Every structure is written in structure tokens, then in C-alpha cells.
Design a protein around this ligand. Sequence first.
Ligand SMILES: [Mg+2]
Ligand SMILES: [Mg+2]
Ligand SMILES: [Mg+2]
Ligand SMILES: [Mg+2]
Ligand SMILES: [Mg+2]
Ligand SMILES: [Mg+2]
Ligand SMILES: [Mg+2]
Ligand SMILES: [Mg+2]
Ligand SMILES: [Mg+2]
Ligand SMILES: [Mg+2]
Ligand SMILES: [Mg+2]
Ligand SMILES: [Mg+2]
Ligand SMILES: [Mg+2]
Ligand SMILES: [Mg+2]
Ligand SMILES: [Mg+2]
Ligand SMILES: [Mg+2]
Ligand SMILES: [Mg+2]
Ligand SMILES: [Mg+2]
Lengths: 175, 58, 37, 145, 215
Amino acid sequence: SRVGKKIIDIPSDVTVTFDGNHVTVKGPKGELSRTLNERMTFKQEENTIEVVRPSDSKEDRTNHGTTRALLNNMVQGVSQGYVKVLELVGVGYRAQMQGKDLILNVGYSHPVEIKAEENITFSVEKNTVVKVEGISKEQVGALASNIRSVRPPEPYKGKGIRYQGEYVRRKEGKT
Amino acid sequence: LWITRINAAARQHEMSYSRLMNGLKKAGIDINRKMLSEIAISDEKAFAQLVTKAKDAL
Amino acid sequence: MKVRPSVKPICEKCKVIKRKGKVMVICENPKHKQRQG
Amino acid sequence: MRQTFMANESNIERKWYVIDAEGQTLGRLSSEVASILRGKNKVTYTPHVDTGDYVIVINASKIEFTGNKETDKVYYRHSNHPGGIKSITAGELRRTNPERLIENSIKGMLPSTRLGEKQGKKLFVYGGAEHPHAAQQPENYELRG
Amino acid sequence: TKGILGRKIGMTQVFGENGELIPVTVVEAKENVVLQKKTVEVDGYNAIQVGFEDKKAYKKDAKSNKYANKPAEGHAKKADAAPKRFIREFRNVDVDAYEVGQEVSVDTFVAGDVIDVTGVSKGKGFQGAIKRHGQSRGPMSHGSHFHRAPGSVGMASDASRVFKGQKMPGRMGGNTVTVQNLEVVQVDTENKVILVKGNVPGPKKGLVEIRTSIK
RNA sequence: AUAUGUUAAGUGGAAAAGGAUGUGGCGUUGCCCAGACAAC
RNA sequence: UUGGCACCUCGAUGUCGGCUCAUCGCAUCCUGGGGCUGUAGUCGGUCCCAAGGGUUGGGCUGUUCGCCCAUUAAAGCGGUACGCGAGCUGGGUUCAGAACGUCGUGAGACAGUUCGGUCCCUAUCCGUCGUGGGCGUAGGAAAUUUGAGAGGAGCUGUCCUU
RNA sequence: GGGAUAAGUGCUGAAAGCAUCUAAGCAUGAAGCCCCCCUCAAGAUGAGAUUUCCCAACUUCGGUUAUAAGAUCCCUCAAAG
Ligand SMILES: [Mg+2]
Ligand SMILES: [Mg+2]
Ligand SMILES: [Mg+2]
Ligand SMILES: [Mg+2]
Ligand SMILES: [Mg+2]
Ligand SMILES: [Mg+2]
Ligand SMILES: [Mg+2]
Ligand SMILES: [Mg+2]
Ligand SMILES: [Mg+2]
Ligand SMILES: [Mg+2]
Ligand SMILES: [Mg+2]
Ligand SMILES: [Mg+2]
Ligand SMILES: [Mg+2]
Ligand SMILES: [Mg+2]
Ligand SMILES: [Mg+2]
Ligand SMILES: [Mg+2]
Ligand SMILES: [Mg+2]
Ligand SMILES: [Mg+2]
């Protein structure tokens, strides 16, 4: 595991607390926890965590690559956080806030309300651009995929909810 | 029926049926299954004594 | 999605994977999606 | 027809054991228990009367499986009506009525005679660590693995 | 909520507002009392039981049912009441109302409520296949000797038996049946009747159970 | 029951042409720390 | 399906279609959920999951089959002794009469047409539909109940707003 | 209407420094599955539960006798047959 052997994992003012299997992580915007794995051994030289695989099997090789990946996401999101940005394309497509929740208007016969959840803030730039901010990477990825599934992009014209750097393959169908 | 009862009585001394009558042959004993089943019901103390003579012959 | 007993690459961008015991190919254009069966 | 002991009523002694089922696989527990109920560990075993004794299984919600046979291994059933085939998976029975999961596995390892039905009524199975039968004073019994 | 017992009387019609005509079944629901409150602690489920129509007291040489017997007397005394003929249970109601010995009056329903009615059917006796089930009958001329019998009853020799649930003749009869989503149109307090819109199962002077709609 | 190994499909416990980064074993031969082999 | 073999049935396994009554499979006709499209929209084509329910009235033919008229969301393919005659018809066909054509010296025949031509049985056992008596359920009775299990039900169009 | 799923769509993510719906993990998803609706149901020999009513002497208790609560025979009937 060349990404598992790269087990430097330089911390910050975030505090790392081991508890055997499950590991708690707290910092500026912290309190994350995950029951990681039983086989993997954990060590901290001075503050940098480091992950060592035993037994060199096939199952031990793969999990050594993921366990380093999950720990790096748990500390870097407490450090900086994760933001995913997406846009609206189409005439009359307006999105706006209702305080905590979010309201969309994408050409249906009724508006669509996205009920908010914990640790995630919504924000609207100019009634087209919606930002999703949070601390855990799997959580902000799930909600950003849920709300683009209301109206996915369209081949012939490009209308619909699109990621901020998404490429859309377009066909050219003329009457 | 005789073998089933010998197999039950041998496992109270941590022996199979198979290893009892293996080692009982090597010790030189030539007693039946019928007679061996009746000793284990009647006289438990005598049955435990020929278990040891079969057990050290292995 | 083309289901056929013979899945193969077609162009040079398609790639062969496995998902839950089934052989698939994944490519950039959607006309090359194949799964074996 | 010289001389062979035959058991009898007024001649046999039945006692009470307790098995706990956590961390045990289903069939390897059940094969051990079904030989207790028949009496094949008594030295006075006779095939035409009921020697052998009572068994209580107390945990029964921590039975394990190996492989993928908790989403597979369906249990079928027919109601003698046309098209009345019904089924449930093995993982479903574990979370819902787990006592009938174990006692069906054990009664399938007993013979289908009149005596085999009567021997199967000496089994008592409970989910979770309590049983009512403190009056009969049962003992612990560890599985000869 | 809102259970009550009564017996059928007959069927009439009522002119609604703006001259609309609606058929009406009149049910007399008189002298219903609460007779025992059942509990999840004692019994395992919460319910109340209700007795409908009172009957005469204990007598020494009773030869019929209109005199209560000694088991029924002591049961209907622990709640201070007279012995009743019909006793049913209602487990849809809220058990935290209804002190034992109350009289559930007829105006616990207001006009406009949707209800369900339960009773036993009329009863027809031994009936054949085209009456009891909805079967088509054979031709009546052109040489036929097949008029009101059932048809074939199975296949040939694969399945050398008759399957069960085969719809042969037998007793048509009266069994329990509920009708759903009726209405209460007018409640009379002095006569203690309820008018329901439609028709309910049973013969006259039967026994119906009215309770509120589950949907 | 002893000892060594293979299989993860209930294969075992009913079939082919073909297809496939499924996993073990044995060989020949390329590019190797001068920095490949990826991604930048 | 048309066939090959000739293993049960010759001291009889006794009949094509239609009627009545059903039950199963799915290689899906409709409805449901999806992918791709040479899919602008409305419509369509093709593939995948899916068997819960539903799946038409007439004219001509003994007809199966098939053609046609009108409808429908749709008018699916097959198995069950080519499902079912101790449940029904008996138009057809292996019966005796008669006639045409053809063949035959002839008696007769075709497998080619046409008219007419007798369908038995009081249900013993298993099985199914409904209804009762006896015993049991560690005292005997009346009344109200829980629900392990089982059965039923499960369809769909048109119009108005957006 | 709720729960779990099919084809399918995904999030994070290594093996294989990339990419990857999957290997470990987290979601969603059919009129089909299980519940929800109606009916039968403790001969469910595993024979269940609550409320109320009733309680004997002889005796060789071998059984006899009379009996309680409660039922039935018999008679007048139908909303049932
Ligand atoms: Mg090809
Ligand atoms: Mg008709
Ligand atoms: Mg197999
Ligand atoms: Mg194979
Ligand atoms: Mg043939
Ligand atoms: Mg022959
Ligand atoms: Mg021959
Ligand atoms: Mg004969
Ligand atoms: Mg299919
Ligand atoms: Mg005409
Ligand atoms: Mg036929
Ligand atoms: Mg027949
Ligand atoms: Mg002639
Ligand atoms: Mg001539
Ligand atoms: Mg004539
Ligand atoms: Mg004629
Ligand atoms: Mg004719
Ligand atoms: Mg009258």
C-alpha cells in the first residue's frame, strides 16, 4: 500500500484520541468518531499518527490502504472542512432559503423542499449557485448528490442541476 | 446394542470406542462385546481397571 | 446497457471491471455500457 | 438369550442440563444436543424405552452462521392449498421467533416415530439468558467439541 | 373510539337538504353500560366490554335464557348494574375514559361521522352452486341434460384428487360481515335511535356493532 | 482422527462454443534503485 | 409440432371440436420500475427487473386454424390423458340404406363428394363441500377473549386544472 | 401507508500513489415480498388467558347413595333450519 505506507498524516491543533477500535477526533470544528478496524495497529511518533499492517495478506493489504484514508479525512475536515458547489441552468430556475431548509423551483408543478440536517450549512449566491459546507466528507457528498437528483442535466440543451465543474455531453437534435 | 453401550462407557474415561478396542487387543485381552457391556453396567470399578491396561498399551 | 454473453472493449477508453460477481465494462460514451449475462 | 440388561420404568434416572448457545454454530450445537435427548451417553441405553434427559437452551439469539446462509437458506412450507408455497429466510427467523429456529433444527435430527416425538418434548428453548425452570435444578453442560 | 351496540328495526327514507332523498336504516341503541375494563397488565391488551340489553333477575326454576343465572349475576354486580343479554368488547376506544358502570349514551355520535357496522348475515340454508357462488348455468334446450350442476371438478390423472377450496354446494348461511365508510345522518336522543345512510347486514331485530371508521 | 495444501462458488449437490485484471503453482524473457513502473 | 423406437395397456386405457369449471409456468399482451436510442416535443424502436390482477362481443365455416365487422388499456404464448363425456352436447368421423364422378369383366372399392342414422351405471374407499355426536385438555360450570397458523381481496379508463 | 429488496442510480474508498457504486462501510430504489384491510381460528394433545358461580358423607373409598352451580328429556315456536 503505497498510500498506506505514506502514513505521515501531519496533524494540527486538532486533538487525536485513540480508544482501541473506535477513535475520536476533536479540534476547532470536531467531535468525529468511527469504529475503524481490529487488525490495524496505530502509533503516534510525536503527534503524527502512523498505520502499520500486520500479516501481509491480501485482506490486510487492502484495509491498510483504506484506514489511512479515513483518518486523513477525519482530521482534515475538522481542520478546514469540505465544500461542494453546484449550479442551476435554465430559465426560471430559482432556488432560495427558508431559514434552515432549502426551496427549489425547477419547472415542476410544485416546489421542492430539502430538509436540512446536522453539521451542514446551505447558502445561495445569486439564486443559481448553491453551496454545501461541512466537516465529514461522506456526509456532504451524499446531500449534494441527493439534490442534483431532483432535476439532472439534459443532453439537448443542458438544463438542470449541475456541479460547478461538471462536463456535460451534449447532443444536437434538431426537429 | 453392545457397541453403543461400550462407546458410552468409554467416553467417561476420555476414550473413543475405536481406541479402546485397539489398545485392548494389543494388551492381549480377548473378552466379548457382550461381556464387556455387562461389566460396565454391573461393576464400574472393575471396568475402570481394564481401561488403564488398555490405555497404557498404546 | 448491452447484456450479452461476450463483453469486450470496443474503443481505447473503455475498461473492464467486476461488481458483485458480474463482469462489466465502463466507458465514457454511454453506448459502450456492457454487463455479462 | 442368555443375559443382557434391559432398561425399564422404575429403573431409569432423568436429569436436567443447561446449554448456552452464544458463539456456537447452529448445526454443530444441534448435533450434540440431539444425542443427549436420545440417551446415547448413558451406559444403560436401550432402544425401545426413553432413557435420556432434559435439555434447556438459554441464549438462542446469538446463534452464528458461516458463509452467506443468513440471506440464503430459505425455509419452505406448504398449506395444502393450490399455490400455497410460503417461505422465510434464515436471518429473518433469527431476529423474529429465534426459538423456532433452533427447535426445528434439533427435531429434524430425531426419528419420526412415536417415541421420537415424545423425546423431542424434552427440549426447552429461550431467547436471552433466563429460564423459568429453577425448580427442577438444572446443571451446566459444556459441549465436547 | 366510539363504540355502541344496538339492534336493527327497519328501513325508511329521509329527505335531506335541498330535496335529496337518502335511504336510511334505523337502529335502536338503548341502555348500554360499561361492564369491565381490561388492562395490559392483567390481561395483555387494553379494552372495555359493554352489555347491551337488560333481562330479568335470577329465579329458582328458570327454563330459558331471559332470566340470568348465578355466574351472570355476580359478574353484572361487581359493576353495579342489571344483567344484560349481549356482551361485546371494544378495543379501539381509549380506555382512560369510561369509568366502569357508566352509561354510554347514544349521542356520542354526531351527524356526519363515518362509521363501520358489523353483524351476521341473513342465512339461506342449503344452497346450490349457481346461487351460492355466481356460476353460469347450462343451456336449457338443444338436447342438454345439464342445467344447474357444477361443471368439471378437476383434471384427469395428474392430480388424481380434488383440490381444496373447490366451490361445491352447502350451507349459504349467515356469518359475520362488516360494511365500511357509512355515515350517521340523524341522532335522536329521546327515542335513542341512530339513523345510518345505507343498509346493514342481518334480519330484523338483529344485533349490530357500530364503531368509528378505521380509515 | 493425525499431517500438508486448494476452494468462497452451498462449487460440492446435473451441460457447450465463447468471454473475463478471480485466485494458487511452475518456467523463459524484458525495464530495475543511474531512479523505472503511475500522477503531477 | 411432423416423425423414429415398439417398453405398459387386446379377459377394452372407449371418442375431434364446442359447453361448464378451473389450476400452473413465464420465453410478459396491458398496467408498474429502469437503461440505450439514429430519443427535440407528442409518438416510437430495442434490452433489463417483474407473473399481483386483468386479458371482448358478432358474421362465414363441424370445424381446430383462418378472414372480416365493430370495440378495448389490452384483445399474450404454452402445460395439465392435444385439462375435464361414471359433469353435458353429438355437428364431424370406422356401422348397416341410397346417389354422383372415377377405377374394376365382375362381386365391389375410393378416402373423393352428398342426404339420413340408439351416448348405460341407485357412489363402497380415497378425495372435496357443508354439518353433528364422543372423549380429552389434573375439580366442575357460564360468559368474554388472545391469536400460532390459514384463507380472501389485489383491475382500470375518461375529463378539468398545472 | 410503513419496512426490507430486484434491474438500476449513487457517496466515500483501497487493492493498483491514478481511476473505480465494493472489497470493508453509508444511502436510494417497483402495484412484486412482509405488515397494514376483511373472515376462520387453542383437537395450537404446545390443548392458552381474564371475570364470575359452586364444594360429601358413607367408606373395605372397592365403589354406593343422594346431589350442588349448571345442563338435558318433554312441550309452544322462528329472526334459524
Ligand atoms: Mg459480437
Ligand atoms: Mg350463459
Ligand atoms: Mg449445485
Ligand atoms: Mg459448469
Ligand atoms: Mg411422440
Ligand atoms: Mg410391446
Ligand atoms: Mg426388440
Ligand atoms: Mg380386467
Ligand atoms: Mg423474465
Ligand atoms: Mg343470419
Ligand atoms: Mg383431451
Ligand atoms: Mg372422466
Ligand atoms: Mg352401403
Ligand atoms: Mg365400366
Ligand atoms: Mg329423419
Ligand atoms: Mg337433418
Ligand atoms: Mg352425415
Ligand atoms: Mg313474528
